[PDB]
Amino acid sequence: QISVRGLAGVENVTELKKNFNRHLHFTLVKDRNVATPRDYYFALAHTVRDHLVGRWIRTQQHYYEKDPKRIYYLSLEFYMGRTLQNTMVNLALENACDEATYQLGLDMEELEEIEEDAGLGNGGLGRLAACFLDSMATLGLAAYGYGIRYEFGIFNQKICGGWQMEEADDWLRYGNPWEKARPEFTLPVHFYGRVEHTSQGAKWVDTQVVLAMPYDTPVPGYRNNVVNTMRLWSAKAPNDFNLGGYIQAVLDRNLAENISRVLYPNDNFFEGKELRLKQEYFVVAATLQDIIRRFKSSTNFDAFPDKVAIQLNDTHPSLAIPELMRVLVDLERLDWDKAWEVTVKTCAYTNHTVLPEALERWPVHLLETLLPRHLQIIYEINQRFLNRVAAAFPGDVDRLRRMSLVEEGAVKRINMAHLCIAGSHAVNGVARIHSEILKKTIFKDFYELEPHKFQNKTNGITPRRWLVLCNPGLAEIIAERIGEEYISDLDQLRKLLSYVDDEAFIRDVAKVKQENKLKFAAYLEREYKVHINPNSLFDVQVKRIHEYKRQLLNCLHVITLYNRIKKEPNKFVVPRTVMIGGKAAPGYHMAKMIIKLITAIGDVVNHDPVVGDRLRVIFLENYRVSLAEKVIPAADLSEQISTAGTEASGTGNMKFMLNGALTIGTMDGANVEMAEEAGEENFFIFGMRVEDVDRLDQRGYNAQEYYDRIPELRQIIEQLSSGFFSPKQPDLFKDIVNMLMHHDRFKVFADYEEYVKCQERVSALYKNPREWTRMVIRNIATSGKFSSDRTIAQYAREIWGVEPSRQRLPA
Amino acid sequence: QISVRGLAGVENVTELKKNFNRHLHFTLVKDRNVATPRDYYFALAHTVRDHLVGRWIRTQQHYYEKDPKRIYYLSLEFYMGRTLQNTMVNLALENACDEATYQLGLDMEELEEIEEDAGLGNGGLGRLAACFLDSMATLGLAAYGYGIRYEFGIFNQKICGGWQMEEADDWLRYGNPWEKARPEFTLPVHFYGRVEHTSQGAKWVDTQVVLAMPYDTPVPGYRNNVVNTMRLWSAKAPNDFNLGGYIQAVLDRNLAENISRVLYPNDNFFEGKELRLKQEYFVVAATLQDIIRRFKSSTNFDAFPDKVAIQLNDTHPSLAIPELMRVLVDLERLDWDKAWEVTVKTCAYTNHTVLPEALERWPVHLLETLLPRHLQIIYEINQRFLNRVAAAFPGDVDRLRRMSLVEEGAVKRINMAHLCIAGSHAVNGVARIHSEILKKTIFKDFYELEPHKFQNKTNGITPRRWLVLCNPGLAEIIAERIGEEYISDLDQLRKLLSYVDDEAFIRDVAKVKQENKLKFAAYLEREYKVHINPNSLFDVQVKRIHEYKRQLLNCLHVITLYNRIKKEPNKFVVPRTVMIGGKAAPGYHMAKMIIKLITAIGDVVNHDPVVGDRLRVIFLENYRVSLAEKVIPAADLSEQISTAGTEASGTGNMKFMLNGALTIGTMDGANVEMAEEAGEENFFIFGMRVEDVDRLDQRGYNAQEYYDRIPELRQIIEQLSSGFFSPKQPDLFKDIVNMLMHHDRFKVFADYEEYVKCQERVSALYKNPREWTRMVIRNIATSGKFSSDRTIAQYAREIWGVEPSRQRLPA
Ligand SMILES: Cc1ccc(/C=N/NC(=S)N[C@@H]2O[C@H](CO)[C@@H](O)[C@H](O)[C@H]2O)cc1
Ligand SMILES: Cc1ccc(/C=N/NC(=S)N[C@@H]2O[C@H](CO)[C@@H](O)[C@H](O)[C@H]2O)cc1
Ligand SMILES: Cc1ccc(/C=N/NC(=S)N[C@@H]2O[C@H](CO)[C@@H](O)[C@H](O)[C@H]2O)cc1
């Protein structure tokens, strides 16, 4: 149908159809009379995956022959979403499969909806890993993602009576067509035990052994025939494990296999839970053995850093540092200083937050029991590091206690971030302002000691998933004017600037959005039975529920608009559909209250006859990658409204910019760079800058001051307190009111006036469709910087020491 | 190479080779440079299984079109063993695959050794189910095996320091190429809850739900293009299950899934363990819903028994009876009497033992908690049944308490065997003598009430696995003389009687055995590092370790031969290799001692220089179906020496007879029929008959009497007591001696003299190879009756009311 989706040649269509029927018969053991829709999806998935195998085998063979430096991306999260369409896109098979399935009498889009998301991540950090893998494959890097194959990914969110309910994401139930178990590469991982010191150095003995079994998933590059590997470890009990008593022993195998059972969803508050530590060590131990095995299959560890880069995705795999030391020192018998040199040059650390409650600080007593040798190595790293600090800053005793990897206190803890900085040759934040905040505040001491380690690598998103796949209409009208090269060279979108006054292009951009909004309005009626006005402004905030992300500020605005309507019902207002979506971490009480507030607001607003269809508030249930692919192209306004200094980068922001939504946001995270690229005139910037927040903290934030001086804010609070939004439970929202009035870390009230005013300027612009669209064009045209291809090229050159290559491997 | 293994046509070999390379590439994601031996096995398994699919789909389609009466074989055990060779045999693909793999540079036999046994059974009852499935497919019956897909089958046995060690049989670790998950047929199974009585009858409410997910495994008939289904249920938690607390809730899903985790290996002693009851109900509930679903997809349950037979393989699925009643009464609203009529006519029960400690007698309090509605139905069945007994035998109050399904006592129990008899139109034992023992003793009261219910169906073994597959040499020399028809018509083996004096045939039979013995002697050196004389008599006893099976009696004989040698070292004795193998139930202390005794005897005997290679005692580790396929063809003497009245049938006995071993045995179980078929002159029968045992029990068995009157027996006991076989632990075997002397239920000493004497007659015959072989020929020629095809044809005609058919389905 559309050009960017590839050729539907006669020979290819015929072959796809025959292979589809082959798989239906031989793989699914079905014929057309008994086939379920799920069978059809699997026949298609198997048909498509067949095209990956030659490329996958030869990509890996290529790396063995050429022996390039290998990139190991260690993450506990890979938020992959669905794989079928992505694979077709990157293989140029989409139109062909569409045709082939059409001739077979099937709707491919309906088949695509059957695939479960690989929801092996929580939010931004997990999706970043996924975008990165895609960019690394597209840029021809010898890169491997390493993580855990969770049996249960992020929970499915259900909303019952306005409340979030979690249910197990049993994503593997029907089997995953995209993975290949690799049992011959099964590796033992050790836990507990004790350290014996001999003449021949330390020995870690009496350990419990869990097996790590790898599963390989293909990561296809964009039309370059490169297929990289994502290797996820699953926990398996050894067969002599725990071996009435016989039965129990077999049942207790579950204990060892619990390690890979479930993704921790608490992206808000670090919990020192032992199972989480086991998961962190599990992925690190298995991965490092696999890395070293591959390194040897080419004595001399001097060349290790020339052949290996390990990227630590936050501190979650920080145990890579003492684990590498452990292997190098205890098993390979390198001296400490040489092992350390190798380690530092091998590892790099990416920080993804400044919220102190999110920092990993593992209780010493836990490491003592679980990983006794690692604790010893950590103490040793700390001593030698603190000797360096003492020498560089003689007499600065407070610097010593601030920089220590060991924090003294009630429970002694290890600061994993301090471990990562000490053990890495590079440390980067994920947006310019965030990287600066690291240098100036939380890692200031470390920056003063080793300024050369600190870098910025502004986040990006893959334009394959986040444009071509989810927004083919927009990709097509762009390709019509500038060709297809921009898909793997997003900077080329700048060429669209000379179309800002092009009437046809303005008409096309606005029509694509309208079509996207219509399709999403339909999706909402079909799957959720809710009726929205597609001519309204689509005002969307989708992201995990956090106080810092200030879904609450959006709530206050919603209520203001509602109250203004109720005050002057016969005044014209630009109609809005306000959509808020996102999961709350199950133990985050405030976030669950916020969700309930949102639904409670919807309950009042969506049923007020006076409101009509001028204002609708919808909570988007079960926000996840596949839902983002639908809602983002349909959005007009992107809410990026975190308190300045709190969102390290954001990536949702970039997805919206790429897909033709205007952004209302604070100068926070990557918003700053987005506004700089587009020009501030084409952005709706409001609120305190970082400096204003700091000034406020010095004086002391008094929420009452705002409540006393803003009558519209007072009314809202009074309505919240008195039970206007919870008639049967008048005090339901007292926690929220209390927090807002007395202990708001994120200064919701401080930005309220400016936000509302800025929101009026949004409504004003939307009244003028032509000028709205010209501003949109100016955003899309400048979103090039935010391609993860750019981010990855920067990592490759500035951190990993490898050159990207856009060259095809032979097909 | 050999004719019975099929044609190796040019077109087939070429196609097998190309499909093998296709699977290696596309399915295993490998090329020849990186392929492991396990990859080669899987490529072959996938290549072969491709040939099953058309036949499987059309067999099932056929049943839907023709709508024949369906046979449901309910078992908690299906001891399938390996599937690859069996499939090739039944599809006539063996020579072709052998050729194809040979040209690819692979040894197919080496590939076959990689396949794990499906060890979903303990011993005879589980193997019976497997042979039966094979015969039902071969006889063109619309038959389904239903059971549980255990994650862990029978434990792998390791022998450490002469002691049995169990390890988990993780048979699914690499994936099972022979199964197809059928998630669309997932069914809920209910546990716990309570019964509400309404106006509209009883209601079972507030239950916990476990999901039952079916996996289908093909059961190919012998060259008739029929492929039946074995459907095994796996336990899955529902997604709202149990839904810090979030993490635990996800982890607790294991509790529900524990149901299908592991096969209970306690074939010796009924344990009223709740998990076992859950497994029994699980397979019954899921199966019955599946049966009823299939019945409806053709209101009128009158025709249910015309369309459905359910065979209960022992009492383990006895809950089928009250479950059928429950569905019919509570869910379909049939009146009791009509539901009962339907139930009785639908169900038949096969008893597999008379050992009272093996009978299922479930504590009432367990049924109360787990299955409250079923208990109520059982009480109701009992009342109406006992009303029938009272009416037929007025005043016989003791009959009433003996026949009750409820046993009063300390804990009230339900006698599941009594439930099965009451709820079934037919009850059968598994050998003529066993069926008679049921009528005369343990079910006498029931036989007097309903004599028409009691039948015999003498056990059988499939000649496909147990001749063609494991003994191709013997199958071939037989086919050379009489053609190939006997493979699915084993009675034709009688034709071999006219070859008893045929010199060429005598030479061939003896040569096949010699080749088999050589191959097995090699197998023992290669995989276990033990060196045996292939010219010795192969004296084998392989079967689960039980006191009743009297491995101990064999032990006494072994020691007698050893002592006689030591007494007169320079006298000629026919050399023997004595092989004993079998697993002990992990909690069966005596059985574990017996294994230790056997190894301890081996330790002494195998290292006595005076003995030489005249006597060797070897414990065959990890006896299982795939090992039986090796050892049985190599055996000369089959030890079938259970105390008369204790082995219901035996089937190992039939395997040995078919494969050219002579049998030393008691008149017990099917031995009686084997001796009758072959003629007693061609059998080594010894020991007490059933009547002699009964006489002994009346007087009282005094083991001392034998110890006092048999000096050779005294010496053995003294040696056992004094530490001759355990020098470092002199009292190690005091339990055995004590049991033998004071509490031997199985009268080991009573048969000792006759056994030893009979064993001399065996040695005498073996001295004359020509006459040994002529007797062997006379056994093989009369083993026809013991084909499970005969057994199944009897079930079909006399119990299920269906005609077998040897006709091909179109290919
Ligand atoms: C891209 C690509 C290409 C080929 C393959 C081949 N895959 N080949 C096998 S046999 N895949 C297996 O299939 C099962 C699916 O039910 C999984 O449960 C199992 O984990 C997986 O290893 C996998 C991925
Ligand atoms: C269990 C657990 C513990 C901690 C976490 C942390 N999760 N941390 C995230 S999702 N960090 C996010 O990373 C993105 C990518 O750089 C940024 O754009 C975004 O600003 C930042 O908040 C998640 C789960
Ligand atoms: C005889 C026959 C013919 C075709 C098939 C087709 N089978 N097709 C699939 S996708 N089989 C799956 O394969 C996985 C193996 O790794 C299993 O883990 C899984 O349980 C099984 O359902 C199965 C049996």
Ligand SMILES: Cc1ccc(/C=N/NC(=S)N[C@@H]2O[C@H](CO)[C@@H](O)[C@H](O)[C@H]2O)cc1
């Ligand atoms: C957990 C558990 C509980 C009970 C059992 C019972 N297992 N019961 C067996 S294996 N019964 C056997 O059945 C064969 C087939 O008819 C007969 O030839 C044989 O004589 C008989 O002993 C097995 C496991």
